[PDB]
Design a protein around this ligand. Structure first.
Ligand code: HEM
Length: 152
């Protein structure tokens, strides 16, 4: 649960991402894959990437980065009222993609890391706090749907 002040911070930070959604998306996925190589194995269409240079050079990775952050942004702009938007993602990721909730924790922290890296000194303590809470909320609501489905 976030206050409106906190949501304001979230959407303020998100403005940074929207100025370059493909660059942000790309770096988020790269941070995930290199930080946690087991995550790469969940992607049939990225599993061929061995090196970060191949990752960086991959237009399809940047494309998927755009898809992921576009979806996350749509969810964030709902300010918590995201049941309709979130349920199909929860379903596809539990039943089709088989993504454990741990990997959602991974990509959450990766987003935090990328924002600091691309906006050093421009991502303040209050902004980090708000973003972290938003991603926890996202993750927690997914987790509820995972439990429903009996998925680990
Ligand atoms: C902020 C977190 C995430 C968002 C917003 C997100 C969103 C999406 C969307 C919109 C799609 C395409 C439609 C669909 O299949 O439902 C997708 C596909 C997919 N996602 Fe996620 N996702 C997230 C996290 C993750 C993580 C952490 C993993 C694995 C470590 C993952 C693995 C996959 C895979 C394997 C596909 C299908 C890729 C393909 O073959 O095209 N996702 N995701």
């Amino acid at each position: 649960g976030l206050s409106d002040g906190e949501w304001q911070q979230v959407l303020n930070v998100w403005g940074k991402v929207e100025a370059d959604i493909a660059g942000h998306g790309q770096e988020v996925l790269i941070r995930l894959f290199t930080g946690h190589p087991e995550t790469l194995e969940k992607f049939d269409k990225f599993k061929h990437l061995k090196t970060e240079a191949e990752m960086k050079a991959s237009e399809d990775l940047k494309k998927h980065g755009t898809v992921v952050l576009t979806a996350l942004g749509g969810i964030l702009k709902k300010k918590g009222h995201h049941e309709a938007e979130l349920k199909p993602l929860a379903q596809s990721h539990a039943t089709k993609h088989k993504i454990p909730i741990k990997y959602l924790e991974f990509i959450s922290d990766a987003i935090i890391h990328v924002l600091h890296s691309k906006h050093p000194g421009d991502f303040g303590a209050d902004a980090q706090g708000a973003m972290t809470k938003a991603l926890e909320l996202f993750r927690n609501d997914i987790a509820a749907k995972y439990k429903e489905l009996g998925f680990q």
